[PDB]
């Protein structure tokens, strides 16, 4: 059967040099939060920006179905913390990266479980 | 003076007591823009200052609070204001938003369409509106009370705002309605609030604090809007972003304000006192059900 692959489409679009999705909603916050990846309120630390989740979700922003079988969205209604160095492309970041199921941090951007 | 470190400026009471005539709004800093923090959208900064101001009032904040946000879509397809509202509101607060065109939101439910198609079974503790038609700032015709979405909003307040609840409704020099001002007299307190980030605009938010369901004071809304313009015309507000850099006390204190279902016979002076203090919400505490009316047409042959 045939399902469009949007994740791959955006990744190849980025590699080919296309400009990242814009108008992700960045929040004002203290930048003294827990640094966890996805939270119910902005939790950015000194090295993160906080964004509204829906605006950083590729499926939300492109009006396409979510790859969850039930269509549920990880990010919508929450806040996603993006390393300030990757905050030019929050959608690409969230798509390409993974939250540690134990400590709640981004794998490779805060998760120290593996040390 | 110190107004620059506030989230904004509220209409001083003495201006509300005047009997001015409607003039054109002439803001000396018109066209200026405040310096927003790096990467921060205007509508994020504006709603943040609004909520910062709201934290200084006596809002009822019950458990299972219910908030509805009209005019929530931007021209970008996202809902910056809804995101600030959800950050501000206690976690778990039921948040519904709506706008004419399609948009992506962090709200628990979003209704797309004219606001007049929106119906809800239940009552609300807080109503936010940023509804605005920019075609209204037409400076060559007379500036009369506007109807449109404002007629809907006055009806929605009377019918679906819980007693003790609060509202904030964007207006401008030209986007305003006299009955809405009149309604402000149905609250324990009211003001027009100008965010410091947008002080160069005739925009303000009409805030009614703690709804009482009946006129507490009688307001002529043509006169009050003229009072509001007179204030803006004679009180330059210095653009400022300063309050955006301090967010430590931003979240709305969950006060666990009490909810009681009550009948009109039972609203006495003690109750009304409590309503007036942000200490009581009166409404059903049922489940929250909303709908958007859909017009059906077949355009074939
Ligand atoms: N003002 C001194 C700083 C310069 C401002 C600007 N760059 C400018 O040149 N003008 C031309 C004339 O100043 C006169 C005029 C029309 O009243 C000016 N103006 C004043 N308040 C205005 C408006 C205005 O239109 N509109 C649409 C308003 O909503 N408000 C609140 C705008
Ligand atoms: C300045 S914008 C909203 C900005 C948005 N709140 C944000 O957070 O960035 C004005 C909005 O009012 C809406 N709106 C205007 N008139 C409406 C009407 N009769 N019914 C429903 N929505 C309306 C527009 O579609 C438009 O999105
Ligand atoms: Cl897009
Ligand atoms: Cl009056
Ligand atoms: Cl009642
Ligand atoms: Zn999504
Ligand atoms: Zn971990």
Confirm if B34 and B197 have CB atoms less than 8 A apart. Answer: yes
Confirm if B229 and B202 have CB atoms less than 8 A apart. Answer: yes
Q: Which of B41, B102, B106 sits opposite A54 (nearest CB)?
A: B106
Cα gap A66→B280, rounded to integer Å:
41
> A35 is written with which tokens?
């640094």
Chain A CB within 8 Å of residue B251 CB: yes
Q: Is the torsion defined by CA of B141, B144, B145, B151 positive or negative?
A: negative
Cα gap B290→B85, rounded to integer Å:
19
Q: Which residues contact A22 (CB under 8 A, 6 or more apart)?
A: none
Query: B87 and A55 in contact by Cβ < 8 A?
Result: no
Please count the other Cβ atoms lying within 10 Å of the Cβ belonging to residue B249: 8
Cα gap A99→B187, rounded to integer Å:
47
Cα gap A95→B33, rounded to integer Å:
35
Q: Which residues contact B144 (CB under 8 A, 6 or more apart)?
A: none
Cα gap B203→B197, rounded to integer Å:
11
> A20 is written with which tokens?
């990242």
Please state the atom number of ligand 1 nearest to the C-alpha of residue B24.
17
> Would you mind telling me the total number of residues written for chain B in this entry?
301
Q: Token pair 């307040």 is at which residue?
A: B157
Which residue's CA is the nearest one to ligand 1's atom 1? B28
The response to whether A57 counts as a known ligand-binding position is yes
Q: Which residues contact B97 (CB under 8 A, 6 or more apart)?
A: B68, B69, B70, B72, B79, B82, B105, B107, B109, B110, B111
The DSSP bridge pattern shows strands B66-70 and B124-129 to be parallel
Q: Is B32 in the pocket of ligand 1 (CB under 6 A)?
A: no
Which residue's CA is the nearest one to ligand 1's atom 5? B30
**H/E element, B241:** none
Count of alpha carbons within 13 Å of B138, Cβ hemisphere only? 8
DSSP state, residue B104: B
Q: How far lies B8's CA from each of B48, B172, B196, B204, in Å? A: 11, 16, 4, 10
Confirm if B167 and B211 have CB atoms less than 8 A apart. Answer: yes
The experimental method behind these coordinates is X-ray
Ligand 1 centroid to B237 CA: how many Å? 15
């Amino acid at each position: 059967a045939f399902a469009v692959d949007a994740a791959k489409a955006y990744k190849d679009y980025l590699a080919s040099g296309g400009q990242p999705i814009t108008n992700c909603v960045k929040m004002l916050c203290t930048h003294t939060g827990t640094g966890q990846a996805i939270t119910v309120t902005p939790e950015a630390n000194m090295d993160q920006e906080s964004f509204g989740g829906a605006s950083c979700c590729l499926y939300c922003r492109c009006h396409i179905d979510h790859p969850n079988p039930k269509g549920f969205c990880d990010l919508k209604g929450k806040y996603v913390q993006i390393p300030t160095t990757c905050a030019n492309d929050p959608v690409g970041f969230t798509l390409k990266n993974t939250v540690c199921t134990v400590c709640g941090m981004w794998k490779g951007y805060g998760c120290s479980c593996d040390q | 003076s110190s107004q620059a470190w506030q989230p904004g400026v509220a209409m001083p009471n003495l201006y509300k007591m005047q009997r001015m005539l409607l003039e054109k709004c002439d803001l000396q800093n018109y066209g200026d823009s405040a310096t927003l923090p790096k990467g921060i959208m205007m509508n994020v900064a504006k709603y943040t200052q609004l909520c910062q101001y709201l934290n200084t009032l006596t809002l009822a904040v019950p458990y299972n609070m219910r908030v509805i946000h009209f005019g929530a879509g931007s021209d970008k397809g996202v809902a910056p204001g809804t995101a600030v509202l959800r950050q501000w509101l206690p976690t778990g607060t039921l948040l519904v938003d709506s706008d004419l065109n399609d948009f992506v939101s962090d709200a628990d439910s979003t209704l797309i369409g004219d606001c007049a198609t929106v119906h809800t079974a239940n009552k609300w503790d807080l109503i936010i509106s940023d509804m605005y038609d920019p075609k209204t700032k037409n400076v060559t015709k007379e500036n009369d009370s506007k109807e449109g979405f404002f007629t809907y909003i006055c009806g929605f307040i009377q019918q679906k705002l819980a007693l003790g609840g609060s509202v904030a409704i964007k207006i401008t020099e030209h986007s305003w309605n006299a009955d809405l001002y009149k309604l402000m007299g149905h609250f324990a307190w009211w003001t027009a609030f100008v965010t410091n980030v947008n002080a160069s605009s005739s925009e303000a938010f009409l805030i009614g604090c703690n709804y009482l369901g009946k006129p507490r004071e009688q307001i002529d809304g043509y006169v009050m809007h003229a009072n509001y313009i007179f204030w803006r015309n004679t009180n330059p507000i210095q653009l400022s972003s300063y309050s955006l850099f301090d967010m430590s006390k931003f979240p709305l204190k969950l006060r666990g304000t009490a909810v009681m279902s009550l009948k009109e016979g039972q609203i006495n002076d003690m109750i009304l006192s409590l309503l007036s203090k942000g200490r009581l919400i009166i409404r059903e505490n049922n489940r929250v059900v909303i709908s958007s009316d859909v017009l059906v047409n077949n355009e074939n042959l």
